[PDB]
Amino acid sequence: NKCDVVVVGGGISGMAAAKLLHDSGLNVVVLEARDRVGGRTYTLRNQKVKYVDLGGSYVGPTQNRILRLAKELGLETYKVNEVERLIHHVKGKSYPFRGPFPPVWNPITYLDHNNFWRTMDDMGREIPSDAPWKAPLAEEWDNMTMKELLDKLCWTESAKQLATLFVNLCVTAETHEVSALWFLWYVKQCGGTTRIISTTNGGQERKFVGGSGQVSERIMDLLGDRVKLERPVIYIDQTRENVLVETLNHEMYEAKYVISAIPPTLGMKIHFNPPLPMMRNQMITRVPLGSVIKCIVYYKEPFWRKKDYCGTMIIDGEEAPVAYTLDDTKPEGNYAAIMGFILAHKARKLARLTKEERLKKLCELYAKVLGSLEALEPVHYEEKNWCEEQYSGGCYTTYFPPGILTQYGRVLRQPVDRIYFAGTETATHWSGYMEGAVEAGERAAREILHAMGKIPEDEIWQSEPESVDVPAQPITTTFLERHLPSVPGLLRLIGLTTI
């Protein structure tokens, strides 16, 4: 019934917010729509897999908030396997390699690939993490899709194809679906291209022992009966002295403040009194989530390792159901498995098939890429299509179509009277990730603490000490990477010498 703060949503963001407020001495209630906590994280447990993350899973260096929260809750990490060679599969052929980036030998194609990644980061440096709409060329960049940007930037099909794969994998959307400004912001706010794509020293370095679902579960344990499951919020009324929050199962909650810790568009599932301000009213209809099926195929042994493959495959081409895989074997070396993502339009297309049909397609692809008949002998399979989730809307996160970020971006975390906004989408560092969920939840909680006069303004945004367990190596470039010309740059140099 009556409390200090109602938190809507029991994903990592809502749970982090509720924990901070509870630890500060406030009476909190978490209203969660599902019969479980965790949201876009979900750890399945059964005999065949022990445990498997079907949602968010990976953590890495510079993600210090999720690492600190998880450590406090008694969790540990382990390293994703990257000992052996990675594979880039292009035009029906596999090319083994080492390092974060697939190597290119052709001098022209090399210049083009080098320029693409460099330019992504160059453009990123002009975009403020906390206010992308303030970039000098914000409007110009926001009014084009990533498809248009790639068409302008990439002078080789090889670079364009890899860049396209990169976009699909990063944001589970097509290049023509997303704003260039928003995408460039997204990469920059994760620390740039190298940091976002890397396993070793990047976002995919580690997983939690026992699954990421334990983060939300263990906070629920701490909060006890304060977390209310199967309580979808339907109505928020701010016309009176205290805020009134109503659920689908007819219960009413009274609070001084509310934290909305749900994906921005899912705010549409709530009826507001008074109506939302114009800008937010329209913003929440303009911000979809991406499309992905996460698929895990289990084998008797991690047979790829014997061929000096780590299990990482970057797979180009329309025919391939999965464009990217990682070894998902347990740290102990058992429950051998390959994790793959079916991305964007392919998630839409292949959802039509049965689970068994998708398993067959994946195994046949992996057999081709790994050059191994053993890939045709799976022992188990698990998958989750996030497009079907009423209380997620998709995965991994919210994307912005052309024109939206400059027009509506300012609104994302602007309080509406006594409602404050959390959720990973409102983060300024690793927005879209579990790390961003923690940042946003704790920041929203502190906004309320400030509103109550409990903390000063300069304490709303708090820095995070670097993890001792997961140290971050700096991102470096070589002299040649910095100064080699683009393709048009080389042609301009040719045009001058000839004159």
Ligand X SMILES: *[C]C1=C([C])[C]=C2C(=[C]1)N([C][C]([O])[C]([O])[C]([O])[C]OP([O])(=O)OP([O])(=O)O[C][C]1O[C](N3[C]=NC4=C3N=[C]N=C4[N])[C]([O])[C]1[O])C1=NC(=O)[N]C(=O)C1=N2C#C[C][N][C]1[C][C]C2=[C][C]=C([O])[C]=C12
Residue 101 makes contact with its own copies by CB under 8 A: no
Binding status of residue 234 toward its own copies by CB under 8 A: yes
Residues 61-100 that bind ligand X (CB under 6 A): none
**Contacting residue, 170, 322, 369, 404, with ligand X by CB under 6 A:** 170
Closest to its own copies by CB, 17 or 404: 404
Of residues 49, 197, 343, 412, which one binds ligand X by CB under 6 A? 197
Nearer CB in complex with its own copies: 219/283: 283
One-letter amino acid at 319 equals: E
Q: Which residue has the tokens 């794509």?
A: 197
Nearer to ligand X, 211 or 378 (CB): 211
Quick one: tokens of 293? 């099926």
Q: How far apart are CA 156 and CA 111, in angstroms?
A: 10
Q: Where are the alpha helices (DSSP H) in 143-201?
A: 146-153, 157-171, 180-188, 193-197
Q: What is the dihedral of CA 19, 24, 27, 30, to 10 degrees?
A: -20
Which of 5, 7, 10, 246 lies at the binding interface for ligand X (CB under 6 A)?
A: 10
The Cα–Cα gap between 304 and 372 comes to 8
What is the x/- site pattern for ligand X, positions 122-161, by CB under 6 A? ----------------------------------------
Among positions 429-468, residues that touch its own copies (CB under 8 A) are: none
**Interface segment toward ligand X; rule CB under 6 A; list 69-77, 97-105, 217-225, 431-439:** 431-439
176 touches, from its own copies, ligand X, none (C-beta below 5 to 8 Å by class)? its own copies
Is residue 192 a contact residue for its own copies (CB under 8 A)?
no
Q: What are the backbone angles phi and psi of residue 351, rounded to the nearest 5°?
A: -65, -25
Cβ(133)–Cβ(124) below 8 Å: no
DSSP string, 72-98: HTT--EEE---SSEEEEEETTEEEEE-
Give min distance, CB of 29 to ligand X, in A.
11
Q: How far is the CB of 334 from ligand X (least distance, A)?
A: 22
For its own copies, the closer CB: 174 or 217: 174
Instruction: Give the residue with the Cβ less far from ligand X, 138 or 245.
Output: 245
Bridging pattern class, strands 5-8 and 257-260: parallel
Residue 290 near residue 171 (C-beta atoms within 8 A): yes
- Quick one: DSSP state of residue 115? H
Nearest to 393 by CA among 235, 213, 267: 267
Residues 212-271 that bind ligand X (CB under 6 A): 232-233, 261-263, 266, 269-270
- 274 preceded by a cis bond (ω within 30 of 0): yes
**9 is in the binding site of which of ligand X, its own copies, none (Cβ under 5 to 8 A by kind)?**
ligand X
Task: Give the integer Cα–Cα distance in Å for 424 and 442.
Answer: 11
Residue 290's nearest CA partner among 394, 386, 383 is 394
**Edge-to-edge, what's the strand order for the sheet holding 252-255?**
252-255, 243-247, 233-237, 271-273
* Site residues (vs ligand X, CB under 6 A): 8-14, 31-34, 39-41, 55-58, 169-170, 196-197, 204, 232-233, 261-263, 266, 269-270, 292, 294, 324, 386, 391-392, 395-397, 423-424, 432-435, 437
* Site residues (vs its own copies, CB under 8 A): 143-145, 147-148, 174, 176-177, 232, 234-235, 248, 250, 265-266, 268-269, 271-272, 275-279, 281-282, 285-289, 291, 345, 348, 351, 385, 387-390, 393-394, 401-404, 407
